[PDB]
């Protein structure tokens, strides 16, 4: 379903845009329903949960007699749901704002996060918006730049910081948005070096053999060294075997 919004550069410039979900993990539409083994009927089974205290007598506590809490070190601090909603971070939903512009070399692919890719086109039946979006895309492509932007699906959606980069094709041109990591999402792990390791240094024969192996197992073939490459094993066109 199309997602309408406005790409805003500051408080004076606004371009109407529509976003679609291009690539995402696909799951089964129909789930497994638990049925009674004998009668084979759904309505013959009922799942429920109960809460009991940790005392020896195993007292019974109702769902209205419990609250939500968190852990703060070695102690536990109560934090009710209403209090959390009152103290919750509140933001204005449906925001697509350009925080800034940065060189493409500074946004690495390995830092991409999330579970979606968004394709942003101009608003349907809108010539001015299309012209503005085309101008922005062409400028970004010419300058080799990407836009660091803030994205929020709706009011009750956590804000995200992502990167939008141009994608120009002979048929259509559009922006491609992918989420980017926060400060808390980065892991700082140190690994030993391999080049400088004395006991893990391959010899000339090993390197030659590995080169031969790589050459023999090529999955792309040049078209008689004339125009371009051709893919022997395209994995994008293979249907998911799980559903099959």
């Amino acid at each position: 379903i199309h997602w309408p919004c406005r790409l805003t550069i500051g408080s004076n410039l606004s371009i109407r845009i529509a976003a679609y979900k291009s690539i995402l993990q696909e799951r089964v539409k129909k789930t497994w329903t638990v049925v009674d083994a004998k009668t084979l009927k759904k309505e013959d089974i009922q799942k429920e949960t109960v809460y009991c205290l940790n005392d020896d007598d195993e007292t019974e506590v109702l769902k209205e007699d419990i609250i939500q809490g968190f852990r703060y070190g070695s102690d536990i601090v109560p934090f009710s749901k209403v209090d959390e909603e009152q103290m919750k971070y509140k933001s204005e939903g449906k925001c697509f704002s350009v925080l800034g512009f940065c060189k493409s070399s500074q946004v690495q692919r390995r830092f991409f996060m999330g579970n979606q890719v968004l394709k942003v086109f101009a608003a349907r039946d809108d010539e001015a918006a299309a012209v503005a979006l085309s101008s922005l895309i062409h400028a970004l492509d010419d300058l080799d730049m990407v836009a660091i932007v803030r994205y929020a699906y709706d009011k009750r959606a956590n804000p995200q910081v992502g990167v939008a980069f141009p994608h120009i094709k002979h048929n259509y041109e559009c922006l491609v948005y992918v989420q980017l990591p926060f400060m808390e999402d980065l892991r700082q792990y140190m690994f030993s070096s391999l080049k400088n390791s004395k006991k893990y240094a391959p010899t000339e024969a090993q390197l030659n053999a590995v080169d031969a192996l790589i050459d023999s197992m090529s999955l792309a073939k040049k078209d008689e060294k004339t125009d371009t490459l051709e893919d022997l094993f395209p994995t994008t066109k293979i249907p998911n075997p799980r559903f099959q």
């Binding site: 925080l99 800034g100 660091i148 400060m183 700082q188």
Partner: peptide, 24 residues
């Protein structure tokens, strides 16, 4: 090792977030 944090040894000290700062 240079840059090691003084609170959690063995982890790189993270520079404070500066957000967006436009260049000259």
């Amino acid at each position: 090792c240079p840059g090691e944090s003084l609170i959690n040894p063995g982890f790189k000290s993270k520079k404070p977030a500066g957000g967006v700062d436009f260049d000259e």
